[PDB]
């Protein structure tokens, strides 16, 4: 997150860290056994870390559980990042509580202008590099389909939306990928891609989770 604020320990109870010896991606807990992340986050040897503020310190609310199964979207294209969504099932169900809680899936697509909360452990600098160990949050409006396409000609599909600020200074960044965009209690976005971070006229691009609910419910139902 660039231009963000320190969320507060466990204030984003659906925020997961995907670990392979190190945090490499975000994810969102959608029930006791299942995480939604970015398909571009896919690799093997994933441990899901829940109840996490400082990913470098054992602070006392963590649940560490290995991925049993990963399911990349059948139509995920790694070149275009179209359908940048993936499901990870846990070996065991997490204990849900105030600090580790599922986030609701959308029953409807959110609209441009809606305030959303973007979180993750990604880079905090638009130029240079610096990673935070505590979770960062950013409040961001969804931008119009048309201003998204203007910013990124030939690149935005019907499964993407932009959120943030055209003036720049405030964006998601490297290490935020797979992390949530929650809008009015509902998971509307996955941190997907962008041209640099927090650059003028280059906002964050997010997987449009409302397109994928059928797939998520049907997949959870049989796996
Ligand atoms: Ca920790
Ligand atoms: Cl702060
Ligand atoms: Cl389906």
Swiss-Prot record:
Reactions it catalyzes: Preferential cleavage: Arg-|-Xaa, Lys-|-Xaa
Gene3D superfamilies: Trypsin-like serine proteases
Binding residues annotated for Ca(2+), in chain numbering: 52, 54, 57, 62
Post-translational modification remark: Subsequent cleavage after Lys-125 leads to alpha-trypsin. Further cleavage after Lys-170 yields pseudotrypsin. A cleavage may also occur after Arg-99.
Annotated Gene Ontology cellular component terms: extracellular space; serine protease inhibitor complex
Keywords, alphabetical: Calcium, Digestion, Disulfide bond, Hydrolase, Metal-binding, Protease, Secreted, Serine protease, Signal, Zymogen
SMART domains to which the protein is assigned, alphabetical: Tryp_SPc
Active site: 40 (charge relay system), 84 (charge relay system), 177 (charge relay system)
Enzyme class: hydrolase
Pfam families reported for this sequence: Trypsin (PF00089)
Origin: domain of life: Eukaryota
Residues where substrate binds: 171-172, 174-175, 177
Main location: secreted
Tissue: Synthesized in the acinar cells of the pancreas.
CC cofactor note: Binds 1 Ca(2+) ion per subunit.
GO MF: endopeptidase activity; metal ion binding; serine-type endopeptidase activity; serpin family protein binding
EC number: 3.4.21.4
Peptidase S1 domain ranges (all copies): 1-221
Family under the similarity heading: Belongs to the peptidase S1 family.
Subunit record text: Interacts with SERPINA1.
Protein's UniProt name: Serine protease 1
